[PDB]
Design an enzyme around this catalytic site. Structure first.
Site, short mmCIF file in Angstrom:
data_model
loop_
_atom_site.label_atom_id
_atom_site.label_comp_id
_atom_site.label_asym_id
_atom_site.label_seq_id
_atom_site.Cartn_x
_atom_site.Cartn_y
_atom_site.Cartn_z
N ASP A 126 -15.50 -14.51 -25.04
CA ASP A 126 -15.93 -15.63 -24.54
C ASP A 126 -15.49 -16.21 -23.11
O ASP A 126 -14.94 -17.26 -23.26
CB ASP A 126 -16.28 -16.73 -25.56
CG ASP A 126 -17.18 -17.82 -25.15
OD1 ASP A 126 -18.07 -17.74 -24.35
OD2 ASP A 126 -17.35 -18.82 -26.16
N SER A 141 -17.43 -27.25 -24.29
CA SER A 141 -17.47 -25.69 -24.20
C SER A 141 -17.09 -25.21 -22.79
O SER A 141 -17.57 -25.93 -21.73
CB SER A 141 -18.89 -25.07 -24.55
OG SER A 141 -18.97 -25.12 -25.81
N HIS A 170 -20.33 -17.96 -23.05
CA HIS A 170 -21.74 -18.70 -23.52
C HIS A 170 -22.40 -19.62 -22.82
O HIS A 170 -23.40 -20.13 -23.14
CB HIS A 170 -21.19 -19.11 -25.24
CG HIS A 170 -20.74 -20.57 -25.27
ND1 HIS A 170 -19.34 -20.51 -25.68
CD2 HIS A 170 -21.15 -21.59 -25.14
CE1 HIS A 170 -18.97 -21.65 -25.66
NE2 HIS A 170 -20.39 -22.41 -25.54
#
Ligand SMILES: [Ca+2]
Length: 222
Positions: free
Chosen positions: A82, A171, A37
């Site tokens: 992911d 992230s 992502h």
């Protein structure tokens, strides 16, 4: 990272900061493992920079290297899977982070690290922060997130009463712990959560053990 402390220089040398506001880990000296992502998709790409070698992003010892290609997990379209790899034009000369190839370490107290916000809604950080969060079962995580959780592809961590968690900007970074041989091993990739460090809202991470053979496969052909 919320509820953590500053990581010392050299403590987690495999950590890298990616230019779009994500973290990553040196899977190989010239291959960064991050979240799918954090990128657009697979293709030769040179618009991303990885900064390695330092906890202080302002340090003159920072090594900034450009990407040459991005390989997003095959089949990734926003629901699970992911993970992604970024091939670097030059290697970052630091130890790499081994990844978990079995589920043996999907338990215990994990370590997270990143330059993300240290309070929900806050700014990114100059210095790498680290924290410890406990493994949370898929069932506990499902009570927090319902159908949003892809159980066999996501591993959760954090306290039910909140207080310590990854946050925006973390992230893509690695969630890791020690293995039997006293080596850090990567069990997760910072993926998503609801707010940061909130009560009942754990951090959700890509379950690396589920994707280890695919990540290695992608890395050999990258
Ligand atoms: Ca799981």
């Amino acid at each position: 990272v919320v509820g953590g402390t500053r990581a010392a220089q050299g403590e987690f040398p495999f950590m890298v900061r990616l230019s779009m506001g994500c973290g990553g880990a040196l899977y190989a000296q010239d291959i960064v493992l991050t979240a799918a992502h954090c990128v657009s998709g697979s293709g030769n790409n040179t618009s991303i920079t990885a900064t390695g070698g330092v906890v202080d992003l302002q340090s003159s010892s920072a090594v900034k290297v450009r990407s040459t290609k991005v390989l997003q997990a095959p089949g990734y379209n926003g629901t699970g899977k992911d993970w992604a790899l970024i091939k670097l034009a030059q290697p970052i000369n630091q130890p790499t982070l081994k990844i978990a190839t079995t589920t043996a370490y999907n338990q215990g107290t994990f370590t997270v690290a990143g330059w993300g916000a240290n309070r929900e809604g806050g700014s990114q950080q100059r210095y790498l922060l680290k924290a410890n969060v406990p493994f949370v079962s898929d069932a506990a995580c499902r009570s927090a997130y319902g159908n949003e959780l892809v159980a066999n592809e996501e591993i959760c961590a954090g306290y039910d009463t909140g207080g310590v968690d990854t946050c925006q900007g973390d992230s893509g970074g690695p969630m890791f712990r020690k293995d039997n041989a006293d080596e850090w091993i990567q069990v997760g990739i910072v993926s998503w959560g609801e707010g940061c460090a909130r009560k009942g809202k754990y951090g959700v991470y890509t379950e690396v053990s589920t994707f280890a053979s695919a990540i290695a496969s992608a890395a050999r052909t990258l």
